[PDB]
Enzyme design. Structure first.
Site, short mmCIF file in Angstrom:
data_model
loop_
_atom_site.label_atom_id
_atom_site.label_comp_id
_atom_site.label_asym_id
_atom_site.label_seq_id
_atom_site.Cartn_x
_atom_site.Cartn_y
_atom_site.Cartn_z
N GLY A 49 2.57 6.99 8.57
CA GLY A 49 3.94 7.33 8.28
C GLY A 49 4.93 6.25 8.64
O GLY A 49 6.06 6.27 8.14
N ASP B 132 -0.09 -7.54 1.98
CA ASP B 132 0.43 -6.16 1.93
C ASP B 132 1.96 -6.18 2.00
O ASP B 132 2.58 -5.91 3.03
CB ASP B 132 -0.19 -5.34 3.05
CG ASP B 132 0.11 -3.85 2.93
OD1 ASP B 132 0.51 -3.39 1.85
OD2 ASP B 132 -0.10 -3.13 3.92
N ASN C 149 17.89 11.92 11.30
CA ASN C 149 17.08 13.09 11.04
C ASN C 149 16.85 13.18 9.53
O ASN C 149 17.79 13.40 8.77
CB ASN C 149 17.76 14.34 11.55
CG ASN C 149 16.86 15.54 11.50
OD1 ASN C 149 16.23 15.80 10.48
ND2 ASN C 149 16.77 16.26 12.61
N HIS D 222 0.81 -1.21 0.00
CA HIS D 222 0.00 0.00 0.00
C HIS D 222 0.85 1.27 0.00
O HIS D 222 0.30 2.37 -0.12
CB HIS D 222 -1.04 -0.03 1.13
CG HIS D 222 -0.55 0.47 2.45
ND1 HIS D 222 -0.20 -0.38 3.48
CD2 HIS D 222 -0.38 1.73 2.93
CE1 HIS D 222 0.18 0.34 4.53
NE2 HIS D 222 0.07 1.62 4.22
N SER E 215 4.06 3.09 8.08
CA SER E 215 3.69 2.00 7.19
C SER E 215 4.87 1.57 6.33
O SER E 215 5.66 2.39 5.86
CB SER E 215 2.58 2.45 6.24
OG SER E 215 1.41 2.92 6.94
N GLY E 216 4.97 0.26 6.11
CA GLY E 216 6.04 -0.30 5.35
C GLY E 216 7.23 -0.71 6.18
O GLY E 216 8.06 -1.49 5.70
N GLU F 217 24.20 9.08 5.19
CA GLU F 217 23.16 8.74 4.23
C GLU F 217 23.70 8.15 2.94
O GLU F 217 24.80 8.46 2.48
CB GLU F 217 22.31 9.95 3.88
CG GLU F 217 21.63 10.58 5.09
CD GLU F 217 22.45 11.69 5.72
OE1 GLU F 217 23.65 11.82 5.40
OE2 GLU F 217 21.87 12.44 6.52
#
Ligand code: UFZ
Ligand code: CA
Length: 223
Positions: A175, A84, A54, A40, A177-178, A62
Protein backbone atom coordinates in the site's frame (compact mmCIF):
# COMPACT_ATOMS: atom_id res chain seq x y z
CA UNK A 1 4.43 1.84 7.06
CA UNK A 2 5.37 -0.47 9.92
CA UNK A 3 6.86 1.04 13.05
CA UNK A 4 6.42 4.67 11.99
CA UNK A 5 4.55 7.71 13.29
CA UNK A 6 1.54 9.77 12.30
CA UNK A 7 2.93 12.47 10.00
CA UNK A 8 0.31 15.12 10.76
CA UNK A 9 -2.14 16.59 8.26
CA UNK A 10 -0.49 18.02 5.13
CA UNK A 11 3.05 17.90 6.56
CA UNK A 12 4.19 15.89 3.50
CA UNK A 13 2.73 18.18 0.83
CA UNK A 14 4.09 16.30 -2.22
CA UNK A 15 2.49 12.96 -1.24
CA UNK A 16 -0.31 11.73 -3.48
CA UNK A 17 -2.81 8.89 -3.29
CA UNK A 18 -3.60 7.03 -6.52
CA UNK A 19 -7.28 6.08 -6.46
CA UNK A 20 -9.20 3.65 -8.67
CA UNK A 21 -12.29 3.54 -6.48
CA UNK A 22 -10.00 3.02 -3.51
CA UNK A 23 -6.43 3.88 -2.54
CA UNK A 24 -3.97 1.45 -4.16
CA UNK A 25 -0.56 3.19 -4.37
CA UNK A 26 1.31 6.34 -3.50
CA UNK A 27 3.09 8.85 -5.69
CA UNK A 28 4.97 12.15 -5.58
CA UNK A 29 4.03 15.47 -7.20
CA UNK A 30 7.07 16.75 -9.12
CA UNK A 31 5.42 19.77 -10.76
CA UNK A 32 1.95 21.24 -11.20
CA UNK A 33 1.01 18.66 -13.84
CA UNK A 34 3.11 15.51 -13.29
CA UNK A 35 3.29 12.73 -10.72
CA UNK A 36 5.96 10.03 -10.38
CA UNK A 37 5.13 6.56 -9.02
CA UNK A 38 6.11 2.91 -9.41
CA UNK A 39 5.56 1.13 -12.70
CA UNK A 40 4.14 -1.85 -10.83
CA UNK A 41 1.30 0.49 -9.76
CA UNK A 42 0.19 0.91 -13.38
CA UNK A 43 -3.48 0.59 -14.19
CA UNK A 44 -6.06 2.41 -16.29
CA UNK A 45 -8.58 4.82 -14.83
CA UNK A 46 -6.41 6.54 -12.22
CA UNK A 47 -7.61 9.53 -10.23
CA UNK A 48 -4.80 11.37 -8.43
CA UNK A 49 -5.68 12.69 -4.97
CA UNK A 50 -3.63 15.59 -3.61
CA UNK A 51 -3.77 17.31 -0.26
CA UNK A 52 -4.92 14.16 1.54
CA UNK A 53 -4.51 13.21 5.17
CA UNK A 54 -7.48 10.99 6.05
CA UNK A 55 -8.24 9.24 2.75
CA UNK A 56 -11.77 8.36 3.91
CA UNK A 57 -12.91 11.83 5.05
CA UNK A 58 -13.19 15.04 3.06
CA UNK A 59 -11.28 17.49 5.24
CA UNK A 60 -11.12 20.50 2.89
CA UNK A 61 -7.63 20.66 1.31
CA UNK A 62 -8.07 17.91 -1.29
CA UNK A 63 -7.71 18.26 -5.03
CA UNK A 64 -8.96 15.31 -7.11
CA UNK A 65 -7.60 15.29 -10.68
CA UNK A 66 -7.87 12.53 -13.27
CA UNK A 67 -4.86 11.22 -15.19
CA UNK A 68 -4.70 12.01 -18.89
CA UNK A 69 -1.65 9.88 -19.75
CA UNK A 70 0.53 7.31 -18.00
CA UNK A 71 4.07 6.46 -19.15
CA UNK A 72 5.79 3.32 -17.85
CA UNK A 73 9.57 3.32 -18.16
CA UNK A 74 10.59 1.78 -21.52
CA UNK A 75 12.73 -0.87 -19.80
CA UNK A 76 10.48 -1.81 -16.88
CA UNK A 77 10.75 -5.55 -16.15
CA UNK A 78 7.86 -6.80 -14.02
CA UNK A 79 9.63 -10.03 -13.08
CA UNK A 80 12.74 -8.41 -11.53
CA UNK A 81 11.23 -4.94 -10.84
CA UNK A 82 14.19 -3.30 -12.56
CA UNK A 83 13.27 0.24 -13.69
CA UNK A 84 10.18 0.37 -11.44
CA UNK A 85 9.14 3.93 -12.25
CA UNK A 86 6.22 5.56 -14.06
CA UNK A 87 5.09 9.11 -14.86
CA UNK A 88 1.44 10.25 -14.73
CA UNK A 89 0.20 13.44 -16.38
CA UNK A 90 -2.76 15.21 -14.77
CA UNK A 91 -5.63 16.38 -16.99
CA UNK A 92 -5.33 19.83 -15.37
CA UNK A 93 -2.67 21.64 -13.39
CA UNK A 94 -2.89 21.37 -9.63
CA UNK A 95 -3.03 24.52 -7.49
CA UNK A 96 0.19 24.75 -5.48
CA UNK A 97 0.38 26.25 -1.95
CA UNK A 98 1.85 25.28 1.45
CA UNK A 99 -0.28 22.13 1.88
CA UNK A 100 0.09 20.94 -1.75
CA UNK A 101 3.56 21.38 -3.21
CA UNK A 102 6.01 19.71 -5.53
CA UNK A 103 9.18 17.89 -4.49
CA UNK A 104 12.43 18.69 -6.28
CA UNK A 105 14.30 16.10 -8.29
CA UNK A 106 17.88 15.29 -7.30
CA UNK A 107 21.00 16.61 -8.95
CA UNK A 108 23.17 14.01 -7.23
CA UNK A 109 22.64 10.51 -5.93
CA UNK A 110 22.42 10.15 -2.16
CA UNK A 111 25.04 8.16 -0.30
CA UNK A 112 24.63 5.38 2.25
CA UNK A 113 24.03 6.70 5.75
CA UNK A 114 21.88 9.59 4.58
CA UNK A 115 18.64 9.87 6.56
CA UNK A 116 15.42 9.94 4.54
CA UNK A 117 11.67 10.25 5.08
CA UNK A 118 9.31 7.58 3.73
CA UNK A 119 5.55 8.00 3.86
CA UNK A 120 2.35 6.23 2.90
CA UNK A 121 -1.04 4.75 3.71
CA UNK A 122 0.11 1.13 3.55
CA UNK A 123 -0.19 -1.75 5.98
CA UNK A 124 1.10 -1.03 9.49
CA UNK A 125 1.63 -4.63 10.67
CA UNK A 126 4.42 -7.10 9.98
CA UNK A 127 2.09 -10.05 10.60
CA UNK A 128 -1.54 -9.61 9.64
CA UNK A 129 -3.17 -6.50 8.26
CA UNK A 130 -4.32 -3.08 9.47
CA UNK A 131 -4.57 -0.20 7.02
CA UNK A 132 -4.46 3.34 8.42
CA UNK A 133 -6.67 6.11 7.16
CA UNK A 134 -4.18 8.93 7.93
CA UNK A 135 -0.70 9.29 6.46
CA UNK A 136 2.18 7.54 8.27
CA UNK A 137 5.84 8.52 8.25
CA UNK A 138 9.15 6.78 8.84
CA UNK A 139 12.68 8.12 9.11
CA UNK A 140 15.24 5.64 7.81
CA UNK A 141 18.82 5.59 6.49
CA UNK A 142 20.08 4.45 3.13
CA UNK A 143 22.02 1.23 3.55
CA UNK A 144 25.34 0.42 1.91
CA UNK A 145 25.13 -1.39 -1.40
CA UNK A 146 27.17 -4.24 0.10
CA UNK A 147 24.64 -4.86 2.89
CA UNK A 148 21.75 -4.54 0.42
CA UNK A 149 23.26 -7.08 -1.98
CA UNK A 150 24.03 -9.39 0.95
CA UNK A 151 20.37 -9.28 2.06
CA UNK A 152 19.07 -9.97 -1.47
CA UNK A 153 21.74 -11.97 -3.34
CA UNK A 154 21.33 -11.87 -7.09
CA UNK A 155 18.41 -9.41 -7.03
CA UNK A 156 19.77 -5.84 -6.63
CA UNK A 157 20.57 -3.81 -9.75
CA UNK A 158 22.29 -0.46 -10.11
CA UNK A 159 18.79 1.07 -10.26
CA UNK A 160 17.87 0.03 -6.71
CA UNK A 161 18.90 0.85 -3.16
CA UNK A 162 17.97 -0.50 0.27
CA UNK A 163 16.83 1.70 3.12
CA UNK A 164 15.73 0.80 6.60
CA UNK A 165 16.88 -1.34 9.52
CA UNK A 166 18.58 -4.73 9.34
CA UNK A 167 17.21 -5.54 12.81
CA UNK A 168 13.67 -5.24 11.47
CA UNK A 169 10.67 -3.59 13.08
CA UNK A 170 10.47 -0.49 10.85
CA UNK A 171 9.79 -0.59 7.12
CA UNK A 172 7.48 0.29 4.27
CA UNK A 173 4.77 -2.21 3.36
CA UNK A 174 1.98 -3.09 0.95
CA UNK A 175 0.00 0.00 0.00
CA UNK A 176 3.04 2.27 0.35
CA UNK A 177 4.29 1.27 -3.11
CA UNK A 178 4.92 4.14 -5.47
CA UNK A 179 5.41 6.62 -2.69
CA UNK A 180 8.29 8.94 -1.86
CA UNK A 181 11.67 8.53 -0.19
CA UNK A 182 12.88 12.11 0.40
CA UNK A 183 16.40 12.93 1.58
CA UNK A 184 17.71 16.45 2.29
CA UNK A 185 14.72 17.95 0.45
CA UNK A 186 15.04 15.91 -2.75
CA UNK A 187 13.17 12.89 -4.10
CA UNK A 188 15.72 10.07 -4.02
CA UNK A 189 13.58 6.92 -4.00
CA UNK A 190 10.28 5.28 -4.90
CA UNK A 191 8.80 2.54 -2.71
CA UNK A 192 9.25 -0.61 -4.82
CA UNK A 193 9.58 -4.05 -3.16
CA UNK A 194 10.94 -6.30 -0.43
CA UNK A 195 10.46 -9.67 1.21
CA UNK A 196 7.54 -9.10 3.54
CA UNK A 197 7.61 -6.05 5.81
CA UNK A 198 9.86 -5.22 8.76
CA UNK A 199 11.56 -8.62 8.94
CA UNK A 200 15.10 -9.19 10.14
CA UNK A 201 17.73 -8.85 7.40
CA UNK A 202 15.11 -7.95 4.75
CA UNK A 203 15.02 -4.17 4.36
CA UNK A 204 12.90 -2.29 1.87
CA UNK A 205 14.14 -1.86 -1.70
CA UNK A 206 13.61 1.42 -3.54
CA UNK A 207 13.91 2.68 -7.12
CA UNK A 208 16.99 4.91 -7.42
CA UNK A 209 15.51 8.16 -8.82
CA UNK A 210 18.85 9.88 -9.52
CA UNK A 211 19.41 7.43 -12.42
CA UNK A 212 16.21 8.58 -14.17
CA UNK A 213 16.42 12.38 -14.02
CA UNK A 214 17.26 12.76 -17.72
CA UNK A 215 14.40 10.47 -18.79
CA UNK A 216 11.95 12.33 -16.54
CA UNK A 217 12.96 15.78 -17.82
CA UNK A 218 12.92 14.75 -21.50
CA UNK A 219 9.55 13.00 -21.15
CA UNK A 220 7.88 15.95 -19.42
CA UNK A 221 9.28 18.39 -22.00
CA UNK A 222 7.70 16.49 -24.93
CA UNK A 223 4.35 15.31 -23.49
N1 UFZ B 1 8.89 -3.85 2.93
C1 UFZ B 1 9.11 -3.33 1.56
C2 UFZ B 1 7.86 -3.43 0.73
C3 UFZ B 1 7.28 -4.67 0.49
C4 UFZ B 1 6.16 -4.78 -0.33
C5 UFZ B 1 5.61 -3.66 -0.90
C6 UFZ B 1 6.16 -2.42 -0.64
C7 UFZ B 1 7.28 -2.31 0.17
CA1 CA C 1 -9.51 13.40 2.82
Amino acid sequence: IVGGYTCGANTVPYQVSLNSGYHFCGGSLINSQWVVSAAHCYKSGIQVRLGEDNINVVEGNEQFISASKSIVHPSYNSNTLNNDIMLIKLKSAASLNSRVASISLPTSCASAGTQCLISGWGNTKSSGTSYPDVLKCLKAPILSDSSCKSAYPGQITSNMFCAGYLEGGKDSCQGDSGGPVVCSGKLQGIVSWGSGCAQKNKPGVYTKVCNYVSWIKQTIASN
